[PDB]
Design a protein around this ligand. Structure first.
Ligand code: NA
Ligand code: NA
Ligand code: NA
Lengths: 252, 256
């Protein structure tokens, strides 16, 4: 419903696009920018970016694409998302031809099926704390089931660009599971994003976002996610650092 | 040798030059790309993350020039982008974030059960002590395809420059993590095309690279000619000090 239009950019020129703020939204449209400059024989397999500034949600965003390399097997792009002459998000992305190699996969974690409910167009559901299967020595775990209510066209771009989008949705939350108490004294915001796209999925079908936050300190927390189809496939991996900061005066 | 990563000639504001196995050259170049970033940053801000892409092989008999971009300079965070260049080509491209000392929620995962290094046996690793946890002693996690644990330590004491330590750790990870992808594929290795595609790192707490670090590694997935790997680095006292993710080429030739 909404997500298609969010990711439908206007081309202003070669390597110049416009989308008409949720971090995932800037992220997703930056990725679409990149993709629309790459031969579709090459499909995206990773992205890295820094959230530099807060978006103005009431204004368009211009995307300036750089064609970093174009080789035989991999193509690489950088995107700067701009508003009011300032870069709000700066991204890299890599793309590869269909090729062959070694195969393996971590098994899907223990999770209940989809459950309570955490973006009207998405069906999002959190695992309640007493239904969570602990794993050894891990301080802070969160499982989230999501999926698009309405079916979506089969375009892999859309599905990947949509997954980029939803991936910024609950992940940083996982860092505050054991800190419910200091949740009115935290400055919170995404600092970065890194994603690896490994396998196909129906984004209109159930996805498990298994999340963890292995560390917090110095006013930051790191989070880590794994995305799975109900049948046990690893679709993507995500890492995200975020601001989790006490004000200048405040001590716990 | 590791201290030579820090040796950069400055050619002009935001332009630096580093002087004259492929994984080794890549790790050098990446490290020097970061050091270049660090020289343009107010030292009140200390590095905490970096992401980069290994674009091209380069020539280890030519010098490299580093082109720094001062992407953002705010009150708490500074951001840099760097392009390492040889003969007009970007060979490596990178970003890093720098923050002042501030405060926030605290937690970390427990150090996994590993055996101490001292009762383990273990030309480019000459400066280092490296001890690979045997498959039979490794504490496995549920559902994991491919884990590996390595202890490492710089043999000789190092200067007290935290940047040198960060580079030391980032260097050894660039030499050792992608190996974790091959743990269960030992019959297939000789046929593979192998390369580093990227790396992403997060530097959380202070440590020392001339003291024991445990690298707890895994390869959660491989396919399509690629392999993803991941790790966390602890001190011997159990402090989690860095996290890394890295993807590599692990490709079958068209024939095999
Ligand atoms: Na190639
Ligand atoms: Na500095
Ligand atoms: Na700032």
């Amino acid at each position: 419903m909404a997500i298609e239009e969010i990711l439908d950019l206007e081309q202003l020129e070669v390597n110049i696009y416009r989308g008409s703020t949720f971090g995932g939204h800037v992220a997703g449209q930056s990725l679409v920018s990149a993709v629309r400059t790459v031969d579709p024989r090459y499909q995206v397999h990773s992205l890295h970016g820094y959230f530099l500034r807060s978006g103005d949600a009431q204004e368009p965003t211009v995307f300036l694409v750089e064609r970093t390399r174009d080789g035989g097997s991999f193509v690489t792009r950088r995107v700067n998302a701009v508003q009011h002459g300032e870069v709000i998000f700066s991204m890299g992305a890599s793309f590869q031809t269909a090729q062959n190699g070694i195969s393996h996969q971590d098994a899907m974690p223990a999770a209940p099926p989809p459950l309570p409910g955490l973006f009207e167009e998405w069906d999002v559901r959190i695992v309640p704390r007493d239904l969570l299967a602990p794993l050894p020595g891990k301080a802070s775990q969160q499982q989230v089931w999501f999926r698009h209510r309405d079916p979506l066209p089969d375009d892999p771009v859309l599905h990947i660009c949509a997954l980029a989008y939803m991936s910024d949705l609950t992940l940083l939350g996982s860092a505050q599971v054991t800190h419910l108490a200091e949740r009115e004294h935290l400055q919170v915001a995404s600092l970065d994003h890194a994603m690896w796209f490994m396998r196909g999925f129906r984004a209109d079908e159930w996805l498990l976002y298994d999340q963890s936050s292995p560390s917090a300190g110095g006013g930051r927390a790191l989070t880590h996610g794994k995305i799975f189809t109900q049948g046990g496939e690893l679709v993507a991996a995500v890492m995200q650092e975020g601001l989790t900061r006490y004000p200048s005066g405040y001590q716990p």
